[model samples]
Target chain A: KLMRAVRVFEFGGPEVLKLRSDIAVPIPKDHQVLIKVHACGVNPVETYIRSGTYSRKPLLPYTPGSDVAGVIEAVGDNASAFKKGDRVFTSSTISGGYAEYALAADHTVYKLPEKLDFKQGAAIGIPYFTAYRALIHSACVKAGESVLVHGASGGVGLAACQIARAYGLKILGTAGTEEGQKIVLQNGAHEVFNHREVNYIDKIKKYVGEKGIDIIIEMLANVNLSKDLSLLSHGGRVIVVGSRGTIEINPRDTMAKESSIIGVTLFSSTKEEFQQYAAALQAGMEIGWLKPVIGSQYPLEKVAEAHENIIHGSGATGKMILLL
Target chain B: KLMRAVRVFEFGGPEVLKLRSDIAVPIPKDHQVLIKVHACGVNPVETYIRSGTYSRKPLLPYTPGSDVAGVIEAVGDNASAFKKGDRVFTSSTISGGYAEYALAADHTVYKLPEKLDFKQGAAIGIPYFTAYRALIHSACVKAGESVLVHGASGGVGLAACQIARAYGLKILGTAGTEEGQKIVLQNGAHEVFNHREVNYIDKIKKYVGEKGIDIIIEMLANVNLSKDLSLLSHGGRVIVVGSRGTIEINPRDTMAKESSIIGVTLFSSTKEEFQQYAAALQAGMEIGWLKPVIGSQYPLEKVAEAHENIIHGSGATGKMILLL
Candidate 1:
């Protein structure tokens, strides 16, 4: 059947995301489920891939989307975990998720919580999974420990804050503006520092006191890694999720505190690893401990605007989702 | 009980090491043993302490040493690990070790193997302990994996090479000169790279093929950290044991591989931790897989020269020892 989808004929600017209504809907093979997508989350990676700047490039004429919230339209014979009409959200797709109907492997499909709407469901995939891996797998953050989230106003940063809070950690966050700071605080961060200031490191150190930060979820490691290591307590960890440039650092900064710098990438996890995070994400939502901060929303036809805003928009505090 | 000792009256250069024959031997306290010093291993930390560059400053007129091999002269009432006349080596000393007699806690003392000489025993303490912590505790290196040791001719680097060899790892080492490279190969490295050459990174990457180095024991982290991270395989770890200067790195180098950079210091371990390593070291020696490489030695009166050589000497390949 004919379905609407966003297709990239060649990598370029946001305008390359051409809307096409003549595309055939994908069919679910064995151990797969076909879902009619309700909304899809827009992430920085999507823009990177679209701009031809990403290291891992898709094949030509690619439909690029990961975070999708939808209802199951059909399931393959061996896909017994999910059934038709089941509301689900997935960051895994066999073909691509930007289409009206997408095929997802049964392992990656997770039931959407009753309380969460399509927007929140779509926002949870990449951000929550990345945050989960950074906190749980990389940092191994324990309860009663403290965490610092850099760039805490963004999608993954807020997700990290929420996950750290759920673990009974004292969560601190850094943001560049007043609006961002407010959003960070609202999303489970106990305190927020203005990272744009020249002395945020000193302020964070003073606030955390002698115990210091046990885990730091770092978004921009190039700008804040040395400071993160400096403020780390004994056995502390800095989990790097993102970076924009390179930064100078003395290894002694980490050595002095017996700390660690761990690099995390959500895309690198195995299907089993993805399943574990998906289950945990569902648990967090069911317990009302996880919430996605929706910064903006755009219609399906305005995906170009969504991508544009993510690239150049100011005052964007959290995730941007595109509704079908 | 007058005993000869080298005391640091003030923090200065090698001249600050004063040989005195009028000092009284220290008495063993509870859980401590008074050891008749045979040989002491001189490390870079000694130089740092003597020059007041160390963060943990010793009290004025303090004796300075940590690695010492000796016979137990006396034992405190609560000390049970060794009796009088027992041959022992210690990596722990409360005051210092540059004396005819030094006091060591039972928890930090390990019986020396019959086959090893006092000089070898003395050399094993800091280097072996630091290597153990970096490889086993910090990096969690498993058997059959590949390891890269930077500055592999140095004390800790050679020690790490031996330990990695004992664990059945394919060991690769890097050194600055031909002499240093030769020493690294003799210690147990399967391959050696001259890091002074600009193409060492490319050489290493080519040598390791597709599966990159699993663990990197980095001695000069400031010079090699970025390269180490770039060459890491999935779940690889770079254990920073020493560094010379600051270096810039992009965290993405590690993030894309789901790797880590861990800072390790032997001094940070607890009593139990120390014992585990000490036991492991003994086991390695007993199996004939571990041996200390003593590059130089000096008599008690020439302690000043030993410190001077470490600071300015060229072609130094292994541990420096001071005989009493």
Candidate 2:
């Protein structure tokens, strides 16, 4: 009746995560499945929630996780998509993924491709989903368009490069370190630039010529959004994926260019769109193009350390994971 | 062979527009039609060009007009769309419309409706096309969505109100005058606000009840854009039609809201989209929905005065025209 799991009875720093072995395993309700968690994905947003700084906070004493790759231990009635012992990855979780077993809605669960291991499969939910939403729906990206992924060293940035490239866009990316730049270039990107350089924007401009970038998938909009505006071609779109704080941009930057700044967030997704993302991402995996990049891994007990690293860590090259 | 016309031999103040009576009538080439000018439209952009401060400048000894309603005096070999003496309005002029005779590419020339007078037909090109572009193409407006037309007193704003309304959008508009408010409400808008009053944003909020505006057609974005962001609903779009100066907006405003700021300019239209605009605008006119509003008219000989009035005029309520 009891399983080892980490619980947050209150909101605070990563220290608030209390791991225990007395937690009861959640019962799978109708249209839900029990996931025997093997690996879990950690995201930047989880850190935000852990710190209690985000606008929306979960109720106290909650298990912390969304993306989990595991075998389905049980399936409730009406969840005819899968039965017991199905290896799958969930786009979301109902109970939580930081436990020996978690519960997920049947609709948000997808079969983990045999090609991807549990850890890699765990990395698919937030970063890839966010990237797909930004490029496909928010930006309305076409095949021939050019895209610039700023801060491409991070999870979402790298995910954007792969997905955008798979969709036939010419991709350019920027990151802080050469090692980070290499990872971006290796992941379905045409070109990569050192973002820390003083003249990186001008260098990018020279490469693009006068046509300008068609889509800019921005990670840290607070620092680069104003400059990104000048880089846009006519009818260009900047999809703001992540912004730490408020940043200002001139309205005049959009006038003659007929450009747009579009915001995207995982929380804002519709049920129908999540279905689309699940299907599209699966196709990407089977095609062998959408590979998830895992950078760091920690034991389930190191949830507190993962939080600090994801929040304060600089030059993060890929997705962080927690192993069950 | 001689025609009365206004020619700009030099670019400067309104005094540079010199009216002459001995100018040769412009000849129609292939795919062109010569027009016997009945009336000409004056626009703020024409004055900006006349002042030589705009980024793009016309050549010296040029005519300063675009919109015109006139009779087709002659047609080139390929201009089979029009026969001699057919009444039409040209969206643009080849030589210029501030003359006894002008020429236009047959593609941009539309037959003036019998129900509308030449003065009203003269007002269609820039204003209607801009409104249609902003709402139809840039904003991709959907039926049943709410739209806020800032500065609804102006030609483009009123045009947006009518077109957006015809497309089944719920429209709210703002103007500086009660007379202007009357015009907006008369032109298919449901509610109109006095922009000069304080707390108008709150009042608009009260009307929308936190659902907020779906599409904002902004005329003076320099003044209202920052405030406009808060007024938008989730996934809302703001079409920036006109901005005199710079304005700043927070990127964070777009994050949770998933809103957008889109820029629109007539010069940015593609040839195919312009063709679409022409056909769509013709339908709007024929269906008895789109009507041009004329506020004042000046003599063609007073072209200098027309330039001064268009440039310095504040709170312009409708299209200004120059009569032959």
Candidate 3:
């Protein structure tokens, strides 16, 4: 049977996402699960990869989606993680997820919680995984320590705020819009800042007092990595969750405080690593702190517009979803 | 009660380290132990603090030494860790260790093995502790992974070579002199290089192959801090054990490989933390892997000249010592 999918023949531009309805349904044979896609998250990183800006890119005619939530239509011969008809959210796709049917290695798939809908499940794949890795793995957070999550209104940003709250960290967030700031505080931030405003670092320092933040979860590392070093407590660290630029830094800044700059990416983490992260997230899901607020939605045909808004949007106020 | 000591009344040149014979001996109390000093290790950092160049400074008229090995002359009311006449190697000193009698907090002191002499015991305090903190604590070494110790013939560098070997890592080292290179290879390094030679990084690449070094224990970080990142494998790290000059870095380098630059210093460590590190060193001491090669020795009166050699010397060469 033919499937409806958005395919990338070549890289560049939001308009490069071409909707095709003639692709044959792929089969799964190994430890893989074939999913009937219902929804997928539109991440800011999706645009960078599509425009050939990121170092890594997809193969030709790639379907380019990872934050997928759907029902498992088929399971591989040895796929022990999930079975037919199971509602699951997955991290990566074998044949790409921006299609009616997508394939995943069962290890990267998790059973969706009863409370969250498909759109929220879609949001969990990238945003929540990236946040969990940044806070728990990369930052190696300790409870009662302060954490400052930059750009805290976006999909990954809000996820970080919620996870930080769940882990009992003093959460400080930054966003541009009023709605974005409210969403951040609602997600469990103790304080919010408009990063577009002046003296935001000074305001953050006031909340942190003498001992600066123990952990800084940086989103826009290119713009703020150097400055973040000055805001750290002794032996504190900056977890580089995202960076879109190359910036100069005085290495001496890291020396005085004995601080560290640790880089992290959810894409590079192992399948087993994602499974371990999903276990912690499942606990958060049951406790009700892990929630994704919907900001913008698009159909498979409108993925081009989703990519547009993701890049040029004022603030990534909440989770962006694509309903298939 | 008159005892010999080197005192620093003001911070400046080597001339500031005044040798005195009329200073009164200090008594131990609480978790304190008064040791009859036999040998004290001289460090390059001693020069920085004495010259008033470091960020933290010792008080006026401070005696300048910490790496100490001696017999216990007195114990505090609650100092149960050791008894009178116990042979001990210690970390920090309550009073300066440059005198005949030195006071120490019991937790920072460890029992010196019968196999080692006073000079070797003195070398243990700073070099071994710094190495353990760098390799085990900062870099988080994994067995079978590669470790590159820059300036490896130096005191801490040699100690790192030993520790990395004990931990089953592939050890590579760099030194400035032939004697230093021989000492490094004799200690534990599988490969050794003269850092002063041309194309050291290129040579290191040949040994490491494509999967670069897992941990780089950096000395002279001012010169190599930026270049070290280029030599790291995915998820690898450069532990900044020593840095004298400020350098610029590209944050983008850390992103693609998810690497880290971690800073470390023994001076900033907590008492309890130092105790834990000392315990690990005591194990290495017994296992015969934590030996210190003596480079130069001076009488108590010649500490002023000792400071000069530590800074302008060819190699940290070995652990510089002051014999009482």
Candidate 4:
């Protein structure tokens, strides 16, 4: 049977996302599952890859999505623990998402709890995994510590806030707008700061007091890294999950505090790590401590519009999803 | 009794060092011990402070040295660790070791084992402590891992090599000179590379094979950080103990591998941490797996010459010392 999918023939602007309706539905291979895509998460890297600026590019005529929520159409012979017609969510293979049918390695797929809607399930894969890997794995954050989530109005940052809170840490988040700050506050951050202010560092210092932050979940390391290093307490950690530019830093800045700067990318995680992330995310949802903040959604045909909103719109503040 | 000492009246060149013979010896205060200095380890920070370039400078006519080994002359009422006439070593108070007498807080002092001479005991204070803090406390290295020690012939670098070996890690070292390379190998590095060559990165990569390095003890992060980040294995760490300059970096480099860069400084360590480092250093000495490499030594009268050798001599390697 024919299936609909978004294809990029060549890297360019958002206008390059072409919707095609004549592709055959993929069959599950060993240890893989085929899912009827219900919702897909939109991420910044998608726009970067579409613009040909990202280092790792998709092959020509590539589908653009990493996360999906849907009903399983079929499970491969080697796949166990999941069956056809089961509700699932997963980080899909490169270029297999943004389509009516998507394939996921069984290791990457997980049950979408009955409590969550498709949009929320689709939003959890990349953002929460990135946050989980940064806080739990990379930084090894412990209880009673203080954390500062830079650019906390968005998906990964919000996820970091809630996860850190779940771990019994004091979470301080930064946002560029009042609405964004409100959302960050609602998402379990102990306090939210206005990042647009020039003296936000002082504000954060004032909020945290003498016992400085033990961890910093940094989204814009290019702009905040030096400041982050300065504000860290003894044995503090700055986990870099995203950056828009390069930064020049003195090694002594971190050395003096015996602090660390850790880098986290969800795509580089191992299968075991992904499993752990899924388990933590499930536990978080079960306790109602983790929730996906869907700021905006677009239908399948409006994928380009979704990309443009995230890439250029000032109002873009949370998870953006595509409904199939 | 009169004692000869080198005092820096003001920050300048080695010429600032003045021989003083009539200054009263320090008496032990609360939790302090007075030591009759027999050997003093000269660090680069001494010259940096003498030249007025260091951020923390001493008061005028200050005696300069932190690493000291000698017999305890007296102990404060509150100091119970060592009694008079007991041989001990310590990271002394700032500007206290160039004199015949030095004062140390009980927490900074450690017992000098019989197998080690006064010079070796003095050398252990800064270098071995710094190494222990970086490897054991900061990086938390595990057994059967791989480590790369940059500038591995110097004080902290050589110390790092031996400590990593004690932890049962495969050690890779880099040196700019043949003599330095010999010292690195003698200190337990499994392989040595010429850091002067621009292609050392490729050499290390070829040597490590697929298992890449688990830890990097970096002395010159400004020159080697980008390369260090690129060569790390999964979950690898670059411990930045020193840097000569700053470098611009993309955070994605670390994020792609889930690696880390940790900063280490000796002065920032707490009393509890100092005690831990002292215990580790003492244990290493008692086991005979650790030894100080004293490349050059001068009588206390020639303190200026000692400083000049370290600041300008190309042949100088290992720990420089001043004997009183």
Candidate 5:
């Protein structure tokens, strides 16, 4: 069947995204299942890649989505993980998710829990995976310990806030606006502050105490790093997930603390590890503790509008969705 | 009765060390035990303070040694942990170990094993305590993993190499000279390299692949940090125990690998923590894993010469000692 999809002919601005309509969905290869994608997720990383700002982009004419939730259209030979017509959620590093049909490795498929719809599954993969890895594996965040999540209302930030709260962590987040602050609070942040303020550093210091924050999920690394280093407790860990402005990190300013700064990215994960992460995410969904906050959705033909909203809207706190 | 001692009226160069003949032997104060100082382990930090360069220094007329081994001469009103004539070892931040009698809090008094002597006790406290905290508590090094001990023939270096080996870790170490390399191998390192000539980083990379070195006990942080950082696998830790040049560290370098640069110093640890560390050190000894490498010992009056030897002896791989 013919499907509508967005494809990038070159790495450039949003103008490079062309809506293609006459392409046939490819059949799954061995150990691969073809998914009839009902929904896909748009991330800041996607926009960065579209604009030639993110260097981790795949080869040109690539699709710019990582999360997809859909029903299985067909299963390839030797694929015992999932059969045709099963509802599933999966993630991958490549560009196929921004289409009507996508292919996921059999190992990547997680049977969508009956409770969640396609949008929730689509939004859950990238953000929740990043948050879960940081909170559980990297920090081993104990119950009642405090976590200060920078960019707290954004996709990754909100996911961390919720996960940390579920694990009994006290959640603190930063926001640029009152709406953003409210969004953060709704997503489990105990407190939210304006990162634009000069006193944000002092406020966080006062909020945590002289010893300061125990765990910090850092995303906006380019600017907040130097001042935020002071907010860590003696044995705190600052997990670095993203850098907004520039990736150049100065060594002298980074290591003075007795604390740790750990780097994290999800696309590099192996198939087995990614499945484990997806299972834990499914468990969170099963308990009704995991819900992906969908900010807004753009129709299949209005992909450019979605990109513009992401570039301008403060309401883009949760996962931005693209619908067919 | 008066005791022959090394007393410094002011924190300065090694020349400020005065051989005093009229300083009275100290009596234990409340919650203190009088230890008849037999041997004191000298560290480079001691020399830095004596030279008035290290930021921390005690008041005038203070004795600068920290690691002391001796028999308890008396116990004050609250000193109940040890009885008179009990052989003990301790690392104290408060000055005065370069004397015949030095007062230590009862909590810091660790009962030395019957097999370990006075010289061994003095060498054990600070170096072993630092290693114990860095290994078990900081890095959480597991058995069967590989640990790379940088500067593996020095005091804390040898101590870390020994303790990590005791835990059944595959130990690798780097030393400056052939003798230093031999010492590290004898001390417990399975692989020893001359860091002066070889690119230990590239060699480690070739040996361990993407599953990098698990734990790195870093001694000279200024010299080997960038190279050591490159050697770390995904979740490696390069513990910064001693850095001769600067304390400033940049977090950006560690952000890529999810690695950590943790600093450890026994002097800043609280009394209770010091006690716990000493217990772990004693446990390592009781298991027949830890042994002190005392290279030279000078009488209390010859403390200056001891400092001079340490400052100039390029081949000094073990504990440089002063006996009182």
Candidate 6:
């Protein structure tokens, strides 16, 4: 039987994404799960992959999504804990999550509680996993430690704020607008600043005093890295998860406080590591801490319009979902 | 009634070092160890401090040494688990190892067995602690991984080479000359490149191949970091203990490989940390795995001459010491 998905026939802008309802449902292989995708996530990387600028390119006529949340329609014999008819969230390395049905490695499929909805499940995987990995693994952010989340209004940024808060970290967030500040602070940030209004470094210094900030989660490196390093206390870390443009990092600033500069790319994680993070995300949802922020949803036929909005970096408050 | 010692009246060329034969031995405070000095290890920081450029400087008019091994003559009231005539080694954040008798914080002293003599004992504390900290704490060099130790003939480099090997790591070392290569190979480096004669980065690529290096103990940063990044595998780290000249580090390089640039400063380590590291260093010595090579030793009167040689970059192999 045919399923529904958004297919991209060419590599250009979002205009190349063609929505259709004629894709076939994939069969479960060994250690695989057949998921009835209730919702799918949209990401910047998906937009990049759709436009062909991403390092790994799809074969052609491919779907463009990384995270999906739904129910397990079937499970392979080798699957460990997951069963058929269980709600699950999975992060796929392959591009098929933007669809009505998708297949993921059994290890990648995590059980979502019956209390959670598909949209919350869908948003939990990509954004929350990225934040959790950055805090718990990459930077090892500890309780009572400070966390400065850059681009705090963005999907991953807001997710970081909530996870850090639940983990008992002192949170600082940066956004581009007053409305953005309110959104991030309401979620969990202890302090929020509008990046467009002031020098973030000086403000952070004034807040942290002699013992400077502990960890900085930066996305726009070109604007903030050098100045951000100044706000770091001795042995602090600046973790890079995303960037607005190419960033030039100065080593001297990092050396002064004997600080560390590390980067994290969730997509580049090993299959096993990705699964572990996905499970942590499930825990977050079970406790009602993780929720997928789907800003808008469109039917399968309207994928092109959704893709265009994502590509233009406009009208997206959270994720843009394509419904079957 | 007096102890002979070498001290610095000012920061400049090594000529500022003076031997004061009439200096009185200092009385121990609580938590202090009084030792009859027998051996001291000289590090590159000795020269860097003499030139006032190590970025970390103690109060002026300081004696220039950190590591010392000798027989404990006495201990303060608060110093426990130690008695007179006990053999020990300790690292002092400031100076005074270049004296006939030196007083160190009891908290930083570690008892050594009769199996270790003064030369190896004094040598063990600084280099081994720095190396162990770099491997276990900073770089986190795991077993079966590959580590590149630059300056492999020097004190810190050789220590890293030996410890990385003891941890079941494959060692690649960069040496300055044929003599240096011999020292590196003897200390368990599987491969040694004469960096002066060949391009070490290209050699590293050819040797490490597709898997690439897992950790880099880098003392040189200029013209090498960019290439080092090229040779690093995913999730690798380059722990920079020292870097010469002014160089710019591009932040993009770190994100591309999901890597890190970590810095360390030994002088600033807490007293407890120093003791822990010193104990680990003694363990390395107890197993007959560590043998300190003293390249040169000078009388207290010749400290000025020693400094001149260090400034010229004509270092003794392993360490250049001053005898009291």
Which residue pairs in model 5 clash with each other?
Answer: A251-B249, A251-B250, A252-B249, A252-B250, A254-B249, A254-B250, A254-B251, A255-B249
lDDT of 4 by residue, A1-324 (tens): 888899999989899999999988888878888888999999888888899988787678789888999998988899897899899888766337799999888887889888888899888888899999888988888898899999898888888888988999988999888899999998878898998899888988887777788999999898888889888998899999888888888888887678899988888887787778888899999888887888888998998888998867775467889999
For candidate 5, the per-residue lDDT at B275 reads 61
Chain A TM-score for predicted structure 4: 0.95
Candidate 1 is graded, for docking, as medium
Worst 10 residues of 1 chain A by lDDT: A310-319
Q: Residue pairs in steric clash, candidate 6?
A: A123-A292, A249-B251
- What TM-score would every model get versus the actual structure? 0.93, 0.91, 0.86, 0.92, 0.83, 0.83
* DockQ of every candidate: 0.78, 0.54, 0.35, 0.70, 0.20, 0.29
Which window of 10 residues has the lowest lDDT sum in candidate 3 chain B?
A: B243-252
Question: What CAPRI-style quality would you assign to candidate 6?
Answer: acceptable
Better by DockQ, candidate 5 or 2: 2
Q: Give a tens-digit lDDT track for model 5, residues A59-111.
A: 77777777889898888898887888888887662337889988777776678
Candidate 1 on B85-144: residue-level lDDT in tens? 999888878657888999888887889988999999888888899999999999888899
- A150-192 per-residue lDDT for model 6 (tens digits): 7777778888988898889999998776667777877788998
Model 1 agreement with the true structure over A117-180: per-residue lDDT tens digits? 8888889888999999999998887899999998888889999999998988999998878988
TM-score of 6: 0.83
lDDT of 3 at A180: 89
The ten-residue window of minimal lDDT in model 4 chain A covers A88-97
How many residue pairs clash per model? 0, 0, 0, 2, 8, 2
lDDT of 3 by residue, A1-324 (tens): 899998999999998999999999988988988999999888777788898878777678788888799899998999987888899988788888888999888877888988999988988888899899888888888888898898898888888888888889988989988988998989999999889888988888787877998999888888888779889999999998877766666666676677999988787788678778988999988888887788778998999988998878767768888989
Across B125-189, the per-residue lDDT of candidate 2 in tens digits comes to 88899999999888899999999999887778888988998999999999887778888888888
Candidate 3 to truth, TM:
0.86
Residue-level lDDT tens digits of model 6 in B130-210: 787778878877799989987777778888988887888989988776777887898899988877765667777877888
Interface RMSD of each: 0.8, 1.7, 2.4, 1.2, 5.3, 2.9
State the lDDT at B192 in candidate 6.
Answer: 87
